[PDB]
Amino acid sequence: GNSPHELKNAAQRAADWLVERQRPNGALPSRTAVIESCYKGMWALHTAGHTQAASAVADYVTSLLQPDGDIPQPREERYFLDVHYLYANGYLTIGAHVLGRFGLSRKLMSFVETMRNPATGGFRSHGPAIPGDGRCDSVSTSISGLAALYTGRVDTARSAADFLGSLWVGQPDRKNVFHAVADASGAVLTSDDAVAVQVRKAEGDWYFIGLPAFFLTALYEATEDRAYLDLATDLMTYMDEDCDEDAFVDSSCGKAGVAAALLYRLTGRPRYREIAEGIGTLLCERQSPYGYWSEEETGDVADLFWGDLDMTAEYVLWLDLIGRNLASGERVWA
Amino acid sequence: GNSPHELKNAAQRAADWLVERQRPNGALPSRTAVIESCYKGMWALHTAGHTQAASAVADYVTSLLQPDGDIPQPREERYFLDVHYLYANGYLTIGAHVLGRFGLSRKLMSFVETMRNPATGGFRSHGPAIPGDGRCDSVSTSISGLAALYTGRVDTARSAADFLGSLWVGQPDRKNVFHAVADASGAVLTSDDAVAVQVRKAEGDWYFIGLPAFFLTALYEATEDRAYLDLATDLMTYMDEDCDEDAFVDSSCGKAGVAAALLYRLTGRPRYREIAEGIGTLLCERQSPYGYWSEEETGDVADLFWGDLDMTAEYVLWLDLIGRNLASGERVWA
Ligand SMILES: [Mg+2]
Ligand SMILES: [Mg+2]
Numbered sequence: 001g002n003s004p005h006e007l008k009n010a011a012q013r014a015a016d017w018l019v020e021r022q023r024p025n026g027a028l029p030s031r032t033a034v035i036e037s038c039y040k041g042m043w044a045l046h047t048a049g050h051t052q053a054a055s056a057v058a059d060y061v062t063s064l065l066q067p068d069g070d071i072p073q074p075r076e077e078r079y080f081l082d083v084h085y086l087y088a089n090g091y092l093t094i095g096a097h098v099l100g101r102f103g104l105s106r107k108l109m110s111f112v113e114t115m116r117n118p119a120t121g122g123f124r125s126h127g128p129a130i131p132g133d134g135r136c137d138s139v140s141t142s143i144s145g146l147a148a149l150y151t152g153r154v155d156t157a158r159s160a161a162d163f164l165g166s167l168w169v170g171q172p173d174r175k176n177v178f179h180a181v182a183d184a185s186g187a188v189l190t191s192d193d194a195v196a197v198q199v200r201k202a203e204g205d206w207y208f209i210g211l212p213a214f215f216l217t218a219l220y221e222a223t224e225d226r227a228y229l230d231l232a233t234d235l236m237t238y239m240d241e242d243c244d245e246d247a248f249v250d251s252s253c254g255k256a257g258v259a260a261a262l263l264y265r266l267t268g269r270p271r272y273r274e275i276a277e278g279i280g281t282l283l284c285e286r287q288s289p290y291g292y293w294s295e296e297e298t299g300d301v302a303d304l305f306w307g308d309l310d311m312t313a314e315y316v317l318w319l320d321l322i323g324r325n326l327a328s329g330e331r332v333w334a
Numbered sequence: 335g336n337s338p339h340e341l342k343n344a345a346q347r348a349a350d351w352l353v354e355r356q357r358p359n360g361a362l363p364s365r366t367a368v369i370e371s372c373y374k375g376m377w378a379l380h381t382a383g384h385t386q387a388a389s390a391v392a393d394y395v396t397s398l399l400q401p402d403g404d405i406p407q408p409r410e411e412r413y414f415l416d417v418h419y420l421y422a423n424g425y426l427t428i429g430a431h432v433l434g435r436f437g438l439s440r441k442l443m444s445f446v447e448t449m450r451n452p453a454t455g456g457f458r459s460h461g462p463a464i465p466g467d468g469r470c471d472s473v474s475t476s477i478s479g480l481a482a483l484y485t486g487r488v489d490t491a492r493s494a495a496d497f498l499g500s501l502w503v504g505q506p507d508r509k510n511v512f513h514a515v516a517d518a519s520g521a522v523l524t525s526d527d528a529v530a531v532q533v534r535k536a537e538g539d540w541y542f543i544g545l546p547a548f549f550l551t552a553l554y555e556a557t558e559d560r561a562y563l564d565l566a567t568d569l570m571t572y573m574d575e576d577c578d579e580d581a582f583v584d585s586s587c588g589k590a591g592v593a594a595a596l597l598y599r600l601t602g603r604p605r606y607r608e609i610a611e612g613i614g615t616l617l618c619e620r621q622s623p624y625g626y627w628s629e630e631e632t633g634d635v636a637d638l639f640w641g642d643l644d645m646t647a648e649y650v651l652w653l654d655l656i657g658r659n660l661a662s663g664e665r666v667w668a
């Protein structure tokens with residue numbers, strides 16, 4: 001596998017690619033003007049040290065911010081409407097906070113908390129303008145708990161972990177399916193219209209498990225409460241031992257990669273280093289020669305379809321996080 | 335002056351200089367192994383995108399962390415013992431937190447809060463092992479409030495600002511001296527053993543005013559409480575109009591420059607941009623050809639006296655912060 005330094009070199013190439021093509025208003029080079037194209041941009045560009053570019057994204061985001069602290073438009077992808085609406089808001093909060101844009105992060109995080117279910121601790125899947133039944137999902141809840149950790153709302157993070165532990169315990173058929181949604185009372189939803197990961201098939205969706213593993217490990221680091229470490233390690237064993245190989249190969253595997261890298265630094269267990277090395281090396285290998293990532297395109301393009309742009313910023317972030325946790329883990333343990 | 339891109343270029347050269355010479359345990363290349371040589375390193379290296387080097391400083395800092403969350407040793411400079419002990423801890427808390435080292439930042443911040451005076455909101459000048467009279471100073475209080483902002487302990491930040499307001503209002507002779515310290519009841523200390531800036535002389539110590547200006551401006555951004563913007567504005571007016579021109583020339587002027595850059599982004603007042611540009615250009619002009627900053631050193635050296643190492647990391651941070659607030663200020667206002 002490639003070294004932590006090589007993972008970082010790859011992240012820097014993509015960050016440079018984004019910055020070279022950033023628009024004057026600060027938007028990143030997407031073929032459609034949608035918030036799901038650049039919600040990871042502030043955090044990703046800041047970790048690459050492109051802080052003026054990251055601040056320009058913050059300027060762009062601030063120009064879209066509504067009085068309630070939400071960015072309800074522009075949104076087109078329905079996963080950002082009724083599956084995990086807050087997935088955009090969570091990265092926006094973290095990126096704003098780490099940049100010191102404390103007014104933006106306060107407003108964003110306060111809106112996120114209006115979508116918290118006080119009884120289960122989960123976060124609602126569908127946004128305010130989107131009809132739904134109050135279901136909460138593992139991804140909305142996980143990213144919201146992580147944003148709460150960065151903004152110091154540790155009680156909210158703990159309550160999100162309560163939701164996740166209940167989702168985990170209540171699974172009716174864990175060998176074959178992970179049902180990632182609970183209803184407004186906290187019962188696991190097995191409806192056809194609720195997100196369900198096919199555990200023993202190569203059909204993606206793994207970040208509904210991997211993002212919880214990352215968040216729970218971060219929450220353990222913040223509190224040293226072993227209950228959170230226990231659930232994170234149980235989720236990682238599940239993805240490693242019980243899920244299809246696709247869990248570490250699909251484009252959504254980066255979340256588990258970060259979780260394994262962090263678990264490695266915190267516990268020193270060698271399997272966690274291997275998982276994170278393997279995932280980081282895989283993302284590095286898929287990078288296009290010109291510096292971005294794309295499902296289908298390979299040329300010297302000037303912009304990307306929103307999903308590739310998001311994936312490109314996302315891998316800047318995961319390669320950086322995997323890199324620094326593996327490098328520190330080697331210093332601490334080896 | 336110099337463009338925001340030019341300031342960032344100087345910061346990046348200095349960060350590269352540091353990282354090339356960083357030691358295997360994570361320590362920065364100081365001729366003496368003291369915490370005051372590298373307390374700004376986590377945050378500075380993170381802003382430069384050098385996240386593996388920043389995390390390596392975190393590993394080093396973590397190895398020194400005591401059970402109470404303090405790093406009482408190694409310390410040698412008196413200013414880090416009984417003038418502003420917590421000045422190290424404050425940057426360490428911010429750098430740990432933005433790196434996601436949430437256990438480190440929680441423990442560091444919680445120790446910082448045990449040195450808060452609950453009656454005045456000030457932070458004690460002398461560490462637990464250092465005999466003293468409970469006096470509290472503007473720098474300890476300012477950096478501790480800023481660390482509270484990054485960690486989401488906003489009530490602690492607001493209480494720090496209350497202290498700074500009492501210190502400002504209580505000045506007995508502000509046209510001639512800025513007494514930066516108060517006793518444990520919050521009365522301004524005028525004894526000869528208490529830090530006093532000779533504001534009509536070119537004799538340094540300006541950061542006892544400039545760091546408060548920066549913190550209060552960030553606290554305004556977090557809360558939108560104009561009382562904090564008002565006090566920041568009065569301190570910047572004071573430094574610009576009542577203080578010797580050395581206030582924007584001395585090595586400690588970077589704090590004021592950052593406050594001015596931030597105030598420019600928030601208010602658009604052109605005088606703030608001029609102050610920030612003037613200070614950033616001055617720092618960029620003083621940089622060595624190799625990347626470090628030093629009062630006396632001019633060779634291609636492998637290490638530095640702790641004060642020069644601290645100053646080099648410090649200018650990486652301030653040039654980055656000035657540059658991105660000036661670049662976004664231009665986008666918003668120009
Ligand atoms: Mg570069
Ligand atoms: Mg099994």
Ligand SMILES: [Mg+2]
Nearest residue numbers: 020290300301
């Ligand atoms: Mg080209």
